[PDB]
Every structure is written in C-alpha cells, then in structure tokens.
Amino acid sequence: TRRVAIGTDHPAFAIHENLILYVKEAGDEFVPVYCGPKTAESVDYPDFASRVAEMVARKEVEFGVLAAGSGIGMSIAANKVPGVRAALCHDHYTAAMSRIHNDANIVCVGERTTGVEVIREIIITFLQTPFSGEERHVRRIEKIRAIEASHA
Amino acid sequence: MTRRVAIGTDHPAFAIHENLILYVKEAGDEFVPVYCGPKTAESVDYPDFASRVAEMVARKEVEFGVLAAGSGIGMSIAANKVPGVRAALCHDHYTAAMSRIHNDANIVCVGERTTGVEVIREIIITFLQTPFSGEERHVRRIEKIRAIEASHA
Amino acid sequence: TRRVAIGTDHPAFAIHENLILYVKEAGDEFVPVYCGPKTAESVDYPDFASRVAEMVARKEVEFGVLAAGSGIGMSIAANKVPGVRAALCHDHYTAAMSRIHNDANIVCVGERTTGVEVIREIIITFLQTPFSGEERHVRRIEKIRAIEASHA
Amino acid sequence: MTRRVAIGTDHPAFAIHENLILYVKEAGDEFVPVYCGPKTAESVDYPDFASRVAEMVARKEVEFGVLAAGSGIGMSIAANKVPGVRAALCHDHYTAAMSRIHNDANIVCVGERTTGVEVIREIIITFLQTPFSGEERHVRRIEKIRAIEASHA
Incomplete structure (x- = not known):
C-alpha cells in the first residue's frame, strides 16, 4: 500500500474528485x-x-x-x-524528473494554469516514476537535508 | 535606491549565466x-x-x-x-507575474533544460517588474508561511 | 470595431462564455x-x-x-x-510572438491542456499585440501565401 | 521496413540540428x-x-x-x-502524444526559443513512438480535414 495525501485550496476544490481518481489510476497499490x-x-x-x-x-x-x-x-x-x-510540475517531463532526480515526495499543480488532462498525466507520472538512486542525486538530496538541519 | 538581484546556477545552466545577467538588466536600470x-x-x-x-x-x-x-x-x-x-x-509569464502578485516571491527559479531562453528572459523581466498586490488575503497567507517556518525553527 | 469570431468543440463548450468575456476584456473595440x-x-x-x-x-x-x-x-x-x-498558443510568449512575427489572425488553445486563466492571458495578449511590420516578417508571410497559391 | 523522418530548421534552430537527428534515432532503430x-x-x-x-x-x-x-x-x-x-x-509530452492518437499527425513542430532541448527530445520520441488510435471519430475528423483541403484545391 502506497498512501497519497491530497490537499487543495478553494478553486481546486472543483477538481478534488478528479485528483482522487487520478491517484487510483496510477495503480491499485496507490x-x-x-x-x-x-x-x-x-x-x-x-x-x-x-x-x-x-x-x-x-x-x-x-x-x-x-x-x-x-x-x-x-x-x-x-x-x-x-x-x-x-x-x-507543469508537464510530464517535470513530473518524471522530480522523481528521477529529486526523489520528490509531494507534487504541486496549478488548476488555473494547467489543464486537467495534463494534471492527470502529471499525477500518474509522478507516482509511477521511481527515484534513480544514483550517487550524485542521493548526495544532492542529503545536501538539502543539511540546509534544513542548519536552520532547525 | 537600486534593487540588487543575486543570480545562481548549476553546471548546465552556466552556459546561459551571461543571458541571466543581461535579462536582469533588461528589466530596468534600477535592477x-x-x-x-x-x-x-x-x-x-x-x-x-x-x-x-x-x-x-x-x-x-x-x-x-x-x-x-x-x-x-x-x-x-x-x-x-x-x-x-x-x-x-516559473515556466511562463503567468506564473512569473502571479508569484509576485499573490506570493510576494523573492526568488524566481527556472529550468534551462525545460524552458527556452526567450521564455526565461520573459519570466525574469516579468518577475522583477511585477509588484506585490498588498491585498489583505495575500498578506495573511504569506504570514501563515512564516508561521510554518517558526514552528520548525 | 474589431470583430473576433469564436468557435469550439464539445469539451470547450463549457468555457465558451469565458472566451466571449476574454475577448471583451481585450478592449471595447473588440x-x-x-x-x-x-x-x-x-x-x-x-x-x-x-x-x-x-x-x-x-x-x-x-x-x-x-x-x-x-x-x-x-x-x-x-x-x-x-x-x-x-x-x-500555450502561453503569453507564443500569443505575443504569433502576432509580432506571423501576423497571426486566428489563435488556437487547448481546454484540456491549458488552464483558463492562461487561456484568458493568451486571448488578451493575442488581440492587443500588434504585428511588427518588419521587412523579414512581411517577406516570410508572403512566402506562406506563395505556398497556398502553388496548391490552389 | 524502417520509417524515414525528414528534419528541417530555421537559422537559430540550426544550433540544435544535431540534437534533432539524435533524438529521432533515440526513438528507435526503425526511425x-x-x-x-x-x-x-x-x-x-x-x-x-x-x-x-x-x-x-x-x-x-x-x-x-x-x-x-x-x-x-x-x-x-x-x-x-x-x-x-x-x-x-507541440510544447510537451501530452500534446506530442495526442497529436498522434487523435490527429494522426505526420509533422511535429517545436520552438527552440520556447521549449528546452530535453523537452524537445521527449516530444520527438513521444511523437514517433505513439501510434494513431484508428478510432471511428478520429478517422471521420481527419477525413473532414481532407475535405477542407479539397474545397480549396
């Protein structure tokens, strides 16, 4: 089971049922x-x-x-x-890269900027694309953690 | 009374660092x-x-x-x-403008491998030229962002 | 008076009233x-x-x-x-360039791809941005006409 | 039985013509x-x-x-x-795919000054790899495009 928490503001509330569906479309495990x-x-x-x-x-x-x-x-x-x-993310490429490079754990989209079919593509791609696990990406992600630590 | 704008890149975007410097200057003599x-x-x-x-x-x-x-x-x-x-x-004019109007954003981020240089130029100029709205709801939301920071400080 | 004809397919029908408004927002002459x-x-x-x-x-x-x-x-x-x-067009830049370079007379947008606020920006920018009238652009536009003529 | 793909540019996009050739090859050995x-x-x-x-x-x-x-x-x-x-x-993966699925598009156009090279790569690969749906309504609409051509021939 891979759980996915969903949040919106007021305008994006109109598509919250969309978002729930798109997560499910990524796979039965989501x-x-x-x-x-x-x-x-x-x-x-x-x-x-x-x-x-x-x-x-x-x-x-x-x-x-x-x-x-x-x-x-x-x-x-x-x-x-x-x-x-x-x-x-605003397209498939950014959705995929956010996972491959950044091991991103939250995807953000704009309902006023990005059409719903592209939002669908973004969510499915984000959830299905694995992190590369490559040395340089792991190092850079650790450096982000170090920035956090320095301000805690 | 001029406004300073710090510029940073990674390795691939270094190829356009001179572009970035020029685009900031193109936003106005005050930048x-x-x-x-x-x-x-x-x-x-x-x-x-x-x-x-x-x-x-x-x-x-x-x-x-x-x-x-x-x-x-x-x-x-x-x-x-x-x-x-x-x-x-930001990936376009609209996001560049709204980052300022709604979020009073102070840093603009762009992707050299995703966004063409002329759109990067437009983004930078729009970001620097567009003022923050100062509207009640935006001020409140920005303060809530500050509160999130404080809770983890 | 600058008249602007509007057409849609079925999914974009939901925003046809939007499109009418956005044209009007470009100016009283539109x-x-x-x-x-x-x-x-x-x-x-x-x-x-x-x-x-x-x-x-x-x-x-x-x-x-x-x-x-x-x-x-x-x-x-x-x-x-x-x-x-x-x-x-998918953004402000393409909307503007289509006029400046190509003296475009029709703007096309995707309702499933582009958010409505960006569609609004595209339409207003398209209608307000004048053609440059520069020598090379006029020549290239004439060459498009020549392609048409060769197939008529 | 391989599939030929003609490539053309203007002057600024000439700088990436070798990119375009590579990206077509990256779509598969058949291209x-x-x-x-x-x-x-x-x-x-x-x-x-x-x-x-x-x-x-x-x-x-x-x-x-x-x-x-x-x-x-x-x-x-x-x-x-x-x-x-x-x-x-096309400006992204979605448009690249849908141009094929819905429109059986035979030419893909991109902007070098608007779209980053890695997205151009994705667009070209997606365009070449994505098959036309062959669905009844799409076939009908494509035929209507042909009819418009004929009316002005």
Whole structure:
C-alpha cells in the first residue's frame, strides 16, 4: 500500500474528485487520502499545504498531491516542512524528473494554469516514476537535508 | 535606491549565466545583477548554489534571487528551506507575474533544460517588474508561511 | 470595431462564455461573434474550425479564436483555409510572438491542456499585440501565401 | 521496413540540428533521420524549409517530419498549407502524444526559443513512438480535414 495525501485550496476544490481518481489510476497499490477542504468556500493554501506536508514528513503517507491556483504557494509552504521535497510540475517531463532526480515526495499543480488532462498525466507520472538512486542525486538530496538541519 | 538581484546556477545552466545577467538588466536600470553562480563549467551540486543565493535574500543583502538549473525543481526545493525565502518555480509569464502578485516571491527559479531562453528572459523581466498586490488575503497567507517556518525553527 | 469570431468543440463548450468575456476584456473595440456549438453534445472540430477560418479569410471578421481539447486539430484544420494564419498558443510568449512575427489572425488553445486563466492571458495578449511590420516578417508571410497559391 | 523522418530548421534552430537527428534515432532503430534543414547558420526564411519537409511528407518520400524554429508557430502554419500534411505544434509530452492518437499527425513542430532541448527530445520520441488510435471519430475528423483541403484545391 502506497498512501497519497491530497490537499487543495478553494478553486481546486472543483477538481478534488478528479485528483482522487487520478491517484487510483496510477495503480491499485496507490491509495488516496483526501485531506482538502469539504466545501468551495475561501481557504488559505498554507493551512492545507501544512496538513499534507506534515503527513509526508512524519511518514504517515508516502506521497502528497497539492492543487491550487498556480501551485506556487503550495510548493513554497510545503517545502517549509523538514523532510518534504515538493515539486511544482507543469508537464510530464517535470513530473518524471522530480522523481528521477529529486526523489520528490509531494507534487504541486496549478488548476488555473494547467489543464486537467495534463494534471492527470502529471499525477500518474509522478507516482509511477521511481527515484534513480544514483550517487550524485542521493548526495544532492542529503545536501538539502543539511540546509534544513542548519536552520532547525 | 537600486534593487540588487543575486543570480545562481548549476553546471548546465552556466552556459546561459551571461543571458541571466543581461535579462536582469533588461528589466530596468534600477535592477543590479549580482552573479554568484559557478565561474566555470565544472560539475556542481545545485543545493550549494541555491543556499548561497537564498541566504543573501534572507539576510536582505539583495532584494531578489534568480536560480537556473536543469529543471529548476531542485533549486526551488533547496532555496525554500531557508527561512524568509519564497522561491517560485516559473515556466511562463503567468506564473512569473502571479508569484509576485499573490506570493510576494523573492526568488524566481527556472529550468534551462525545460524552458527556452526567450521564455526565461520573459519570466525574469516579468518577475522583477511585477509588484506585490498588498491585498489583505495575500498578506495573511504569506504570514501563515512564516508561521510554518517558526514552528520548525 | 474589431470583430473576433469564436468557435469550439464539445469539451470547450463549457468555457465558451469565458472566451466571449476574454475577448471583451481585450478592449471595447473588440467584438466577439460566437460561432461555436449551442450545446455540449459531441461535434467534429473541423466543422467549427472551417466556419471561423472562412470568416477570417473572407474578411468578415479580423480575428478568430478556436478552443478545443488540445487545439492541435483546430490549428491544422483552420490553416487549410487560404489566407488563415492560425497559431496554437500555450502561453503569453507564443500569443505575443504569433502576432509580432506571423501576423497571426486566428489563435488556437487547448481546454484540456491549458488552464483558463492562461487561456484568458493568451486571448488578451493575442488581440492587443500588434504585428511588427518588419521587412523579414512581411517577406516570410508572403512566402506562406506563395505556398497556398502553388496548391490552389 | 524502417520509417524515414525528414528534419528541417530555421537559422537559430540550426544550433540544435544535431540534437534533432539524435533524438529521432533515440526513438528507435526503425526511425531513420533525413536531414533537410540549412547546412549553415546563415539567415533563412522558415516557410522555405517548412515547404521542403512538408512536400516530402505529402509525396510519401518520408513518413514523418520534424520542424524546429524560434517558436514553431510559423513552421506549423506553413507546413499545414501543403495538402496531406497534418502538422502539430507541440510544447510537451501530452500534446506530442495526442497529436498522434487523435490527429494522426505526420509533422511535429517545436520552438527552440520556447521549449528546452530535453523537452524537445521527449516530444520527438513521444511523437514517433505513439501510434494513431484508428478510432471511428478520429478517422471521420481527419477525413473532414481532407475535405477542407479539397474545397480549396
């Protein structure tokens, strides 16, 4: 079982059912855990970025998906949580690379910027693409951890 | 009264570091590029250069940062680990503008292997020229980002 | 008065009211003329590409906007009409360049690929950006006409 | 039984013409690149090279075409003026795949100034490897494109 926590802001609430489906489409082993808003009313993205990011950081779920207007705010807020590597992706290539290079554990998307079929492709690619495990990538990821440690 | 802009790259993006310096200058005479990336084409680790630029922004030695790498993903992750930094991975004009309007972003990240140089130019100029809205909800959300930082400090 | 004919396929019908608004947002002089489907039922994109493209080619309207799934089919079909220069755009830069370089008269977008706020930006930029009128661009546009003539 | 792929560029994209040849080869041993772009960096008009490649596709001398220029917009407009050509301006994996699945596209167009080289690589490989669906509605729509051509012939 590979659990995937999902969070959104208000505009992306309209596609939260989409996001749940797209996670399931990546494979039977992928289990969506919806942690976003329950209504379409205005919320603050950092509150939902934080909820999902903490779950990833505490090893409660393997992955996170954050969808908002542009995804920029989501990516900034999520990355403030130690242990999180949150990747704002806009296409298949970035989705794949975020995993291959960065062993990213959260994918961020913009509902106002990226069409839903490309969001679908991003989520499936993100979840299916394995980390390369190559020496230089492992070293660089360790250096990110070291930046975290220096500010804790 | 000019505005300083720190620039960092990884190894592949070093090939366009002169581009990045020019694009900052093209945003206006008030923008002063401060190049802090690799001086050669030798292999480097992006977090080292992300940290260098991010720390300069956080300490207020410069107003803005520009980070260019393969995808920009690693740069955005690493830079955001520094308290006070709001680093935005941008791929077009719209994201460049909205990073400023909504997030008051202080670092722009781009991917040299993903985004063509003329779009990188547009992103940098738009990022530097676009002011923060100052609207109530955006101020509140940015403060909530600061609160997340403090909880892990 | 600068008239702008609008056409869509079935999925993009959901945003046809958006497209009408975005044209108006470009300026008071821009007048949308909606020529797309009236319902959400399945249609064939070439039928609507052709309708809008013929209007542009016959100088009935100055510009066209075509929105579909990816915009690829729209761009291919519209360009089959002599006098049409249809540009599939995915961002501000392509929207602007299509006008500056190519004096494009139809903009094509994908509703499944490009978020609506970026579609808005594309349409406004397309309509507001003037053609450069530079020697080399005028020459290249004439060469496109010559390709048309050689197959007529 | 191999599949020929004609390649054309304008002047700026000439800098990556060797890239384009390699990327076609990377799609599989069955794909044979046929370079028909400029042999030098001298200034050229894109419609001349769009026409060259488009005519080769239309006459069935090759199966596919690849056109790379500044934005790719001019290439896509010019190539589509040739009867029998379905030229797709692509900016990512999704558009590359859907151009084949839905439109049975026979020419892929890219912008060197807009799209990074690794995404251009992905686009070319995806375009060549992805088969046409052959589904009833797509066949009908492609036939309607042919009908538009005939009405202006």
